[PDB]
Amino acid sequence: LMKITSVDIIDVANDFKWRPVVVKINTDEGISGFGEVGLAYGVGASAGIGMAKDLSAIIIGMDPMNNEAIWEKMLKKTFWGQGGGGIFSAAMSGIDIALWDIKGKAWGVPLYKMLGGKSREKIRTYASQLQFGWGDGSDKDMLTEPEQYAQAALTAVSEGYDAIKVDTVAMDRHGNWNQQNLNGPLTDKILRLGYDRMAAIRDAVGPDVDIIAEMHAFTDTTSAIQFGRMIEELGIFYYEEPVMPLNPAQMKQVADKVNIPLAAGERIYWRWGYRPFLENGSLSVIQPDICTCGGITEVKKICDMAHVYDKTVQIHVCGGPISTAVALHMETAIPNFVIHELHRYALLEPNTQTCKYNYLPKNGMYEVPELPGIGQELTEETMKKSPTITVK
Amino acid sequence: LMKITSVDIIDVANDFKWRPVVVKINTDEGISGFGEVGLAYGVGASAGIGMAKDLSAIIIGMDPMNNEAIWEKMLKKTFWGQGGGGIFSAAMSGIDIALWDIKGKAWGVPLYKMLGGKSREKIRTYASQLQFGWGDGSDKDMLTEPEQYAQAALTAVSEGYDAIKVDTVAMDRHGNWNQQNLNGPLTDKILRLGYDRMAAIRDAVGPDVDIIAEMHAFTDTTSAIQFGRMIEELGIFYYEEPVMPLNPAQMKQVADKVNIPLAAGERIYWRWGYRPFLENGSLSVIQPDICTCGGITEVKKICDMAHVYDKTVQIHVCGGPISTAVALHMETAIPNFVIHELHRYALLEPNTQTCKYNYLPKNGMYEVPELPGIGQELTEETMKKSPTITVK
Amino acid sequence: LMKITSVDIIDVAKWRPVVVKINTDEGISGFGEVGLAYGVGASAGIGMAKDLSAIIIGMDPMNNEAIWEKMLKKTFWGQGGGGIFSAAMSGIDIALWDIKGKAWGVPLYKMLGGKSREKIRTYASQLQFGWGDGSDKDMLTEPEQYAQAALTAVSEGYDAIKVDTVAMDRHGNWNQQNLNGPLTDKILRLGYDRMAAIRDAVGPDVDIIAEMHAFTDTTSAIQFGRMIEELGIFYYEEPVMPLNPAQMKQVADKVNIPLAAGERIYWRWGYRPFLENGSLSVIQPDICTCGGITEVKKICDMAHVYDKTVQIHVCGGPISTAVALHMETAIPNFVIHELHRYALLEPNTQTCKYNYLPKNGMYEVPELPGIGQELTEETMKKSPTITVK
Amino acid sequence: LMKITSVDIIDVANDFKWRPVVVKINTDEGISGFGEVGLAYGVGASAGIGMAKDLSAIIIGMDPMNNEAIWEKMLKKTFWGQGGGGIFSAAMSGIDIALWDIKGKAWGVPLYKMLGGKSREKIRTYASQLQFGWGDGSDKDMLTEPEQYAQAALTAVSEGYDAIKVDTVAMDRHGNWNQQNLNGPLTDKILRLGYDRMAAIRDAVGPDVDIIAEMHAFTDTTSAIQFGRMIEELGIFYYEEPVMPLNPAQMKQVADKVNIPLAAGERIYWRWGYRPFLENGSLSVIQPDICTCGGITEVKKICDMAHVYDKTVQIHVCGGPISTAVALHMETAIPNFVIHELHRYALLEPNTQTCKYNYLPKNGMYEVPELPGIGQELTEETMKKSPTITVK
Ligand SMILES: [Mg+2]
Ligand SMILES: [Mg+2]
Ligand SMILES: [Mg+2]
Ligand SMILES: [Mg+2]
Secondary structure: OOOEEEEEEEEOOOOOOOOOEEEEEEEOOOOEEEEEEOOOOOOOHHHHHHHHHHHHHOOOOOOOOOHHHHHHHHHHOOOHHHHOEHHHHHHHHHHHHHHHHHHHHHHOOEHHHHOOOOOOOOEEEEEEOHHHOOOOOOOOOOOOOHHHHHHHHHHHHHOOOOEEEEOOOOEOOOOOEOOOOOOOOOOHHHHHHHHHHHHHHHHHHOOOOEEEEEOOOOOOHHHHHHHHHHHHHHOEEEEEOOOOOOOHHHHHHHHHHOOOOEEEOOOOOHHHHHHHHHHOOOOOEEOOOOOOOOHHHHHHHHHHHHHOOOOEEOOOOOOOHHHHHHHHHHHHHOOOEOOEEEEHHHHOHHHHOOEOOOOOOEOOEEOOOOOOEOOOOEOHHHHHHOOEEEEO | OOOEEEEEEEEOOOOOOOOOEEEEEEEOOOOEEEEEEOOOOOOOHHHHHHHHHHHHHHHOOOOOOOHHHHHHHHHHOOOHHHHOEHHHHHHHHHHHHHHHHHHHHHHOOEHHHHOOOOOOOOEEEEEOOHHHOOOOOOOOOOOOOHHHHHHHHHHHHHOOOOEEEEOOOOEOOOOOEOOOOOOOOOOHHHHHHHHHHHHHHHHHHOOOOEEEEEOOOOOOHHHHHHHHHHHHHHOEEEEEOOOOOOOHHHHHHHHHHOOOOEEEOOOOOHHHHHHHHHHOOOOOEEOOOOOOOOHHHHHHHHHHHHHOOOOEEOOOOOOOHHHHHHHHHHHHHOOOEOOEEEOHHHHOHHHHOOEOOOOOOEOOEEOOOOOOEOOOOEOHHHHHOOOEEEEO | OOOEEEEEEEEOOOOOOEEEEEEEOOOOEEEEEEOOOOOOOHHHHHHHHHHHHHHHOOOOOOOHHHHHHHHHHOOOHHHHOEHHHHHHHHHHHHHHHHHHHHHHOOEHHHHOOOOOOOOEEEEEEOHHHOOOOOOOOOOOOOHHHHHHHHHHHHHOOOOEEEEOOOOEOOOOOEOOOOOOOOOOHHHHHHHHHHHHHHHHHHOOOOEEEEEOOOOOOHHHHHHHHHHHHHHOEEEEEOOOOOOOHHHHHHHHHHOOOOEEEOOOOOHHHHHHHHHHOOOOOEEOOOOOOOOHHHHHHHHHHHHHOOOOEEOOOOOOOHHHHHHHHHHHHHOOOEOOEEEEOHHHOHHHHOOEOOOOOOEOOEEOOOOOOEOOOOEOHHHHHHOOEEEEO | OOOEEEEEEEEOOOOOOOOOEEEEEEEOOOOEEEEEEOOOOOOOHHHHHHHHHHHHHHHOOOOOOOHHHHHHHHHHOOOHHHHOEHHHHHHHHHHHHHHHHHHHHHHOOEHHHHOOOOOOOOEEEEEEOHHHOOOOOOOOOOOOOHHHHHHHHHHHHHOOOOEEEEOOOOEOOOOOEOOOOOOOOOOHHHHHHHHHHHHHHHHHHOOOOEEEEEOOOOOOHHHHHHHHHHHHHHOEEEEEOOOOOOOHHHHHHHHHHOOOOEEEOOOOOHHHHHHHHHHOOOOOEEOOOOOOOOHHHHHHHHHHHHHOOOOEEOOOOOOOHHHHHHHHHHHHHOOOEOOEEEEHHHHOHHHHOOEOOOOOOEOOEEOOOOOOEOOOOEOHHHHHOOOEEEEO
């Protein structure tokens, strides 16, 4: 049997703010696994590093082949595991991913096969976050006008995407992001702008291009209902994060009043996190992030449990190539996949250059990696220039 | 990629009615996988053979590595899969187990490792169904008197077992098995015999040997409650199948009125079958049979879902060596294992000689197989003399 | 008292109707049918009927209640339920009612509580495969073809049709798209365009049932149902599978069309959660799949408390048709009878002794003792048969 | 108006693993506030440091008087706040407390007056975690025998304590802590030891000393019920953390089956975390830790909301003197207080020397600090030798 000998927690140096963090798990047989901690944006990345560092201390000396036992150890033997949480879970996730990488390298087998094989040959993708533009030379667009939203959609369509996602509310008319109060009942003008932008897209792309309406949970229950009712007639594919998950009854209230399938999951963690949303019937599409919401071991369980309640799965992807890789593996294997999320930045050099292999979509579709393990690793150059903590 | 080229459905010849049925899936690469259809007792083994035969027709030519996709095809593309059922499920299960056998043989790895590794080093066992005796020369005991029940428990203890299970109700005083009407409110004498037998066991073995009370769903709600209340004081480990699963509210009513943890699951199939019992909180211990209740792919998902509602798992085992092997692998990998079921016949030559390898418990503990795949196969001699349908 | 002496389990000479023939020492034989003639599982139904027959040899066939309870309670696997298990149970059960009627010289409907109606209204079922003669093969693709097939059925006197307009793609492939989850508009727009073409052709006074075969899931069932609401849909059949009854309730909550299901829902126990959750308006048990005469009568009775009406699911041979007609004659809560095209045609009807055909969209019930239907001697001669004694 | 100018995140050096972490918030007016991040034990203190660091970045420049607006910013403008979590919450908490310390210093008023004044003159205390002994020279103990547990209780009573808490289950007979599997149905001997130790205590102290049974969530639903039913007759004051909070229905199941009032809260965070336990009626006593479960702003709100459902409050305290101080203030102001938690280590030199002031219980009772703010600060000497990150 192999033994974990050290773990590196890598604060990935990049040219893009943006803080991808990688877990590299090392064995006495010289097989190393790579995982990603999914807190690259928002406020928390330093906490993910210290969390990954703290959890690493407790797995040194263990057999990395025992992912189920290691997952449950991190849940049950850490004290704070049993109260749950996003920082806790994201660090767990990176470690878990790295254990599956090792597992696949040990056997010479790509992740998807270890998750039950090839349930589909190609992965349908959508162009994500169109409020920030699409196409080359759109690298920091802050779109304000309906016509600009329509044009970004059309550019994505011309690139072979038959689905887009967009938050049309959170940018004000002056290009300020998320600086208005969108909680409670809102004056018509605040949401009419969002409506006109969305209706411009639909008018431009026609009925056979799917549109996902993303709210980022910047709205609350009331404003999420008010906006969702407005966009109902636009044929919305699903309605993402209308409200935060802290009281699951609020999501149910949105679902009761808005006739569009709801999606959430990037901020819902583990099977326990999803449970109340499966039981209350509020979600149609679930969006766990493999790098945030529990790792490969737990997200597979999530997807399997959600199938009982007829949910389909769009993995949330907002990190480095490692995050993309593991998402493609999961989406390839599961029966209840719907669509993959592609950010514009994920195609770009400062992202792709961090890692050894470059998997890119063609005509709106990905194919799964075929190398042993997750099929993705940081380059040596990135590791050399990235501040690193090493636990042994 | 490999291809399924033929499937043999094997009506296993044995010296023991008893009708073990084996599914042997063969590939163009010469790797064959073995699985078991768990209908060896009760009424329906011939139907399981014809079911396996019919399902085999739709998997010929498929890549056997895609067990997720194949499982979902058997659910969704058969018509009858989507109505569920025990015969349908048991055939699916035998095919599914054979697919994991292939997977393990392809990679050179034992099953427990592909299910997430070795979560425990030994597997605790109970001596099951003591009403039929225990010890050598007890080969068709039909025990009637409390003292006989005590003695059989004591024999089991002397062999290193620190837990037993027994149905003390279904034998009448004359040695007739399941021939009284045990439905509705019952005269005290009918259940007093059961209680007296159970109390004799507890007195004989003391407090530190566990007793499971098995009812085989021969009782209904009213009599299960009447009996469960009587035996509460005897320190019952769990109370098994007090009522059939067809209306899950009935199990809940028993749970509310009886202060012993309930167990069930050998006649409850798939994630969908467990769902109402998880949601209504009636079961403390779940008992899926891997060979009846959906195979490896599905019973792993059952066990994972059950952990959210704090259920522990005793795999139901009542078939040949193949059934025991797959149970051991599942029980080694899962976090939420409690105990393994050992029947007396499973130790005996007419059972063990059907298969190539001989895994036997020692001082009430099993260890898991280590050979590639499930680590168990029929012998060539058994396959030679066993009536076989071949699908190609 | 008579005694069962033997049972023949008959593989009637993909399409695999299976017949149970129960034989007595008094020379009365009863016929029933195991309702797995399509899908995957007919060989299992044979083995199941074989195994179940072993437990009824030597029994008085007049005791159908005790025999049904024995198959539930004394088989082990009965108490976990299931479609193969229930279908074999059904075929045996039907044969026992046949014996009972033959013994007394009375037709089944009378033994089920009499003639509650004189005629049985029928719909032309599964129009995506065409209607009329020479439409044996048909795999219809275009909206106008769907309307034409509907119009043909109307001209034969049918005032109601059923059609699945979604399961055939534009190229005539059957059930080869993924219809799970939220769907691109075009995938369902084709089904809508087909359905709206039928409505426009037949007018408001011809009923249309939308059949989904549970090929959709909750999300896509809701998306399609909402699309077709405006078309005046009679009911909306099997939008989702029955495995989690809460899913059916979710479709019912979001789609303003009465829901129907039952061909894959078995026994009083299987119907219970759908009665308690309010999801179904119309129930569709198959007498040959979902428990037999004894049990399907109880299903119909229980459903009446919850104001459900009943369309028996019929997709088998003439024996299946016969027993449906008897049940639908006696029950108070009948709505409509299902007629498939193939059921009218020689290869189906020739298997059996008597030919009950509808006229002007109406059936009448058989009047002979028992179920009033039997395999011909010639069919039994050439059909592979297991005999249990 | 004042401005936050810098924040020090202090890894408190100490002669006790044990990792107190202090947030010191510094203003343009030279008023500094002290808070504590409640993650001093278990796995995750490094995460709490990085989380406090990341959160501090967002409040530099803000008016520290606006604790409501700062709290909601940390909730709403961080992304991850809206998914919740223990590390996230604990860092928010340290910051929040330091804001109230500033507020009280600015006005010249102790915290309790700012929380609604003095609702009681003394604060009743229990001697906590008796499995580790009580008295001087016990720093030390890993108690195994019933008689030892009885003696520790007697020593506590002699010091003026009329209440104790103890986990009698998690030490085995050999003095190993939390090393047995306590999930699922359990053989009698595992719990009989715990029962005997607890009955020994009750016999020793008589009826008028309160005993709290602490379980640490090392049990699950089934074993929590098994043990609670055994100790029912011993007159247990409340039953603490019988099961983890991840599925609130599990707490409800213990409540239904065990006739002892339940307590939990050290791993339940914010109003939103308590909500389902209030709605389902499972908890009788709530135990939020001010340093983990949201800070003073949020924990006040928790106690107020809980009062509608007739819950009483025992603040969870297991950190440094700053933790104690803030707990005393909250418990003084709120109407629905029951009892205070005192660990042995909290009286000891390595703990108390970390901070400027020494508040000690007398005869089982504490009194509240009276200085401006929380009335507690690290010493200059501690701050000099403590590894410190400064954000500005
Ligand atoms: Mg999002
Ligand atoms: Mg059993
Ligand atoms: Mg149908
Ligand atoms: Mg505690």
